[PDB]
């Protein structure tokens, strides 16, 4: 299993079905509508991974027939926040599907994230964050890439989604086709709001250079690099 | 002379001084604060070109001492709009300076614009438009790249400015370093407001692909391609 949940109260049940497809019964959403899931490992292979945000049974694209997620207590998650709480980087080599009600989707891993032929299904917005979520008394306040020089890598097989895409990291190295409704890439050492407004920035001690190679198939692309002196190479 | 003014009432006086530096005494601004200058040819070499938007004499960076521009009638231009009204494409191989009061600067040429080691001095915003300005009863209404498949090219020697930069064309092919406070690149066949809000778009009959190669030295980059199906290659 590529995805290994944390042992604690934010660890969802993760099961393998079929020929290796992972099914994640995400944890009960809080009052903000956030399903906050914590992981020791978060990796996706070509069989893909399905996050059950369904209030009634049905057919998933990647895992066939699934029952409803009864953790949801009749209310689907608005945001599925997946947080790696170990030192293990993430490798995403297949599709990630939200089964049931469309939601916003976040993966945070301050140790690094690599995408190569990964994608997102039934998400309104998907965000990859090489950094940590920020909490105050149980409430999500935003995200941080402070004190971090690690990499978001996008491989030759690219990344695809029909929804919005955010790429958030100290630096980004992309070598493949990125397909999305909109692409927002924010680089450097920053604190963010929940909506990825930049609230503060550090100047890195050494250059944090990002590289984008290959096509971007999107009608709207924004690249913001706050590392003063550092550049974006295309 | 690389810059040749139109014979008509929007043709400014253009003089060569020194070792080839061109000095353009821009035409009297209208009530909108726009100095609308029309040209048979608009090309800049390494000696550069200076647009006199000065209310009093002084030292220009590119052309040494210049007197005030008495066409200004005591009011400097807010926008210096340079429009090529012939079929000749533009080649910009040196710096363009606004002498005197800082202003917004536009070059429109629907036949194509090539930059290679060009730059902009004392401009708050500089825009290169492979397209035409739109007028209604003498008033600037915006810009158009409709019915146009021509190219904005940026060469290996790049483009530099301390101000904002807009790159507007059916397609863009960039091979060098672009340095600016912010970079906005809008591609495809579009109509624009004066502030380059996209108001309408055509689908080209064949793909209008843009290519960005090399660094972008800017903290904020926006790329908007309205040609449905067409991509942006980095």
Curated annotation (Swiss-Prot), chains A, B:
It is found in: Cell outer membrane. It comes from the Bacteria. Bacterial hemolysins are exotoxins that attack blood cell membranes and cause cell rupture by mechanisms not clearly defined. The conserved amphipathic domains in ShlA and HpmA may be responsible for pore formation. This is Hemolysin. It comes from Proteus mirabilis. The gene is hpmA.
